[PDB]
Amino acid sequence: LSYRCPCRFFESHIARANVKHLKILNTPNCALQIVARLKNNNRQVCIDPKLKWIQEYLEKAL
Amino acid sequence: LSYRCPCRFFESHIARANVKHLKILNTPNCALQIVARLKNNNRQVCIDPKLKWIQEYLEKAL
């Protein structure tokens, strides 16, 4: 139904250069909260929360 | 023109409970990179990168 967590699967190889932004969803019920909107095709995909470059990218935004 | 950084002003008092998600824009040219989509009215606003609860919210998402 409408009750499924929005991220079923995630991508593990997205390049920072290909991200327009990261969206961090306020979904405590769910295991996967990070979404990227991609530059090359304006697609939204869910991202591996262990993706190498994410921690520094978020830190730097603060 | 189209060359202005997207965040001119920011909000400093947004409640976490009222955020659907945070968007962290990949805009190194710009000083303000954090946007929230609000629960009460589906508006997007730019947020104070010093907002008390943001650091923990992002940390927890990783």
mmCIF file of C-alpha atoms in Angstrom:
data_model
loop_
_atom_site.group_PDB
_atom_site.id
_atom_site.type_symbol
_atom_site.label_atom_id
_atom_site.label_comp_id
_atom_site.label_asym_id
_atom_site.label_seq_id
_atom_site.Cartn_x
_atom_site.Cartn_y
_atom_site.Cartn_z
ATOM 1 C CA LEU A 1 0.000 0.000 0.000
ATOM 2 C CA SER A 2 0.978 3.582 0.823
ATOM 3 C CA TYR A 3 2.669 2.120 3.957
ATOM 4 C CA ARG A 4 5.847 0.880 2.416
ATOM 5 C CA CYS A 5 9.037 2.687 3.266
ATOM 6 C CA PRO A 6 10.017 4.802 0.200
ATOM 7 C CA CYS A 7 13.511 3.274 -0.291
ATOM 8 C CA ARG A 8 13.468 -0.529 -1.211
ATOM 9 C CA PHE A 9 16.810 -0.577 -2.938
ATOM 10 C CA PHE A 10 19.799 1.674 -3.136
ATOM 11 C CA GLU A 11 22.659 2.617 -5.448
ATOM 12 C CA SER A 12 26.237 2.288 -4.263
ATOM 13 C CA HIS A 13 28.261 3.840 -7.042
ATOM 14 C CA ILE A 14 26.916 7.410 -7.573
ATOM 15 C CA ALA A 15 29.470 10.113 -8.214
ATOM 16 C CA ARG A 16 29.267 13.335 -6.247
ATOM 17 C CA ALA A 17 29.749 15.190 -9.489
ATOM 18 C CA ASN A 18 26.535 13.658 -10.711
ATOM 19 C CA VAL A 19 24.409 14.731 -7.735
ATOM 20 C CA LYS A 20 22.253 17.882 -7.897
ATOM 21 C CA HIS A 21 21.433 17.445 -4.213
ATOM 22 C CA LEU A 22 20.973 14.824 -1.440
ATOM 23 C CA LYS A 23 17.585 14.587 0.234
ATOM 24 C CA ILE A 24 17.617 13.121 3.751
ATOM 25 C CA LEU A 25 14.115 11.959 4.476
ATOM 26 C CA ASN A 26 12.543 12.371 7.891
ATOM 27 C CA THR A 27 11.529 8.751 8.048
ATOM 28 C CA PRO A 28 12.565 7.242 11.335
ATOM 29 C CA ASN A 29 10.489 4.162 10.671
ATOM 30 C CA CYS A 30 12.748 3.279 7.721
ATOM 31 C CA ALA A 31 16.227 1.898 7.263
ATOM 32 C CA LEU A 32 17.229 3.932 4.217
ATOM 33 C CA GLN A 33 16.796 7.703 4.387
ATOM 34 C CA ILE A 34 19.153 9.171 1.719
ATOM 35 C CA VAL A 35 18.017 10.051 -1.806
ATOM 36 C CA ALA A 36 20.056 11.789 -4.589
ATOM 37 C CA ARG A 37 18.702 13.688 -7.525
ATOM 38 C CA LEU A 38 21.039 13.008 -10.394
ATOM 39 C CA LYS A 39 22.544 15.599 -12.765
ATOM 40 C CA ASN A 40 22.661 13.451 -15.934
ATOM 41 C CA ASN A 41 18.976 12.631 -16.058
ATOM 42 C CA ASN A 42 17.136 14.320 -13.173
ATOM 43 C CA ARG A 43 16.267 10.902 -11.759
ATOM 44 C CA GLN A 44 15.861 10.394 -7.952
ATOM 45 C CA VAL A 45 17.585 7.292 -6.560
ATOM 46 C CA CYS A 46 18.166 6.045 -3.021
ATOM 47 C CA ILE A 47 21.823 5.961 -1.972
ATOM 48 C CA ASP A 48 24.010 3.655 0.175
ATOM 49 C CA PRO A 49 24.357 5.472 3.492
ATOM 50 C CA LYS A 50 27.987 4.150 3.555
ATOM 51 C CA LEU A 51 28.860 5.879 0.176
ATOM 52 C CA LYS A 52 32.350 7.138 0.555
ATOM 53 C CA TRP A 53 31.900 10.865 -0.079
ATOM 54 C CA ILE A 54 28.575 11.492 1.732
ATOM 55 C CA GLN A 55 29.849 12.107 5.280
ATOM 56 C CA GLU A 56 32.277 14.867 4.198
ATOM 57 C CA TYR A 57 29.652 16.380 1.847
ATOM 58 C CA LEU A 58 27.135 16.731 4.644
ATOM 59 C CA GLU A 59 29.748 17.983 7.170
ATOM 60 C CA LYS A 60 30.839 20.644 4.822
ATOM 61 C CA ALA A 61 27.264 21.848 4.281
ATOM 62 C CA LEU A 62 26.924 22.705 7.991
ATOM 63 C CA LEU B 1 19.493 36.308 -13.672
ATOM 64 C CA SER B 2 19.648 32.515 -13.440
ATOM 65 C CA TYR B 3 23.090 33.022 -11.791
ATOM 66 C CA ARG B 4 21.986 33.876 -8.318
ATOM 67 C CA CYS B 5 22.629 31.355 -5.598
ATOM 68 C CA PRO B 6 19.263 29.684 -4.755
ATOM 69 C CA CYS B 7 19.260 30.563 -1.012
ATOM 70 C CA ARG B 8 19.101 34.404 -0.279
ATOM 71 C CA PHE B 9 17.591 34.111 3.154
ATOM 72 C CA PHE B 10 17.109 31.393 5.688
ATOM 73 C CA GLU B 11 14.808 30.346 8.520
ATOM 74 C CA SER B 12 16.216 29.747 11.980
ATOM 75 C CA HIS B 13 13.295 28.362 13.923
ATOM 76 C CA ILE B 14 12.007 25.282 12.001
ATOM 77 C CA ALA B 15 10.981 22.294 14.067
ATOM 78 C CA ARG B 16 12.267 18.871 13.107
ATOM 79 C CA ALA B 17 8.754 17.580 13.526
ATOM 80 C CA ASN B 18 7.692 19.908 10.765
ATOM 81 C CA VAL B 19 10.287 18.747 8.226
ATOM 82 C CA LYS B 20 9.402 16.162 5.554
ATOM 83 C CA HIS B 21 13.052 16.073 4.508
ATOM 84 C CA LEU B 22 16.258 18.183 4.292
ATOM 85 C CA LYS B 23 17.770 18.769 0.870
ATOM 86 C CA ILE B 24 21.502 19.534 0.860
ATOM 87 C CA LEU B 25 22.260 21.206 -2.421
ATOM 88 C CA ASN B 26 25.443 20.495 -4.335
ATOM 89 C CA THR B 27 26.254 24.153 -4.682
ATOM 90 C CA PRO B 28 29.821 24.805 -3.681
ATOM 91 C CA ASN B 29 29.667 28.301 -5.094
ATOM 92 C CA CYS B 30 27.067 29.247 -2.462
ATOM 93 C CA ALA B 31 27.067 29.980 1.237
ATOM 94 C CA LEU B 32 23.737 28.379 2.115
ATOM 95 C CA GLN B 33 23.144 24.800 0.988
ATOM 96 C CA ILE B 34 20.364 23.411 3.263
ATOM 97 C CA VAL B 35 16.682 23.427 2.299
ATOM 98 C CA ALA B 36 13.721 21.860 4.223
ATOM 99 C CA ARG B 37 10.404 20.831 2.809
ATOM 100 C CA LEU B 38 7.848 21.552 5.473
ATOM 101 C CA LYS B 39 5.096 19.193 6.683
ATOM 102 C CA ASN B 40 2.418 21.817 7.466
ATOM 103 C CA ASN B 41 2.268 23.352 4.018
ATOM 104 C CA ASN B 42 4.669 21.558 1.655
ATOM 105 C CA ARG B 43 6.678 24.764 1.303
ATOM 106 C CA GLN B 44 10.485 24.639 0.664
ATOM 107 C CA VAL B 45 12.543 27.037 2.796
ATOM 108 C CA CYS B 46 16.283 27.479 3.282
ATOM 109 C CA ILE B 47 17.515 26.654 6.787
ATOM 110 C CA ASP B 48 20.181 28.056 9.160
ATOM 111 C CA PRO B 49 23.092 25.633 8.878
ATOM 112 C CA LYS B 50 23.598 26.185 12.669
ATOM 113 C CA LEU B 51 19.995 24.964 13.505
ATOM 114 C CA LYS B 52 20.299 22.999 16.660
ATOM 115 C CA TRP B 53 18.926 19.611 15.595
ATOM 116 C CA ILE B 54 20.406 19.327 12.066
ATOM 117 C CA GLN B 55 23.826 17.839 12.890
ATOM 118 C CA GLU B 56 22.351 14.902 14.860
ATOM 119 C CA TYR B 57 19.617 14.385 12.220
ATOM 120 C CA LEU B 58 22.159 14.030 9.446
ATOM 121 C CA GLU B 59 24.522 11.852 11.555
ATOM 122 C CA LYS B 60 21.758 9.502 12.344
ATOM 123 C CA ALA B 61 20.809 9.140 8.671
ATOM 124 C CA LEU B 62 24.257 7.705 7.856
#
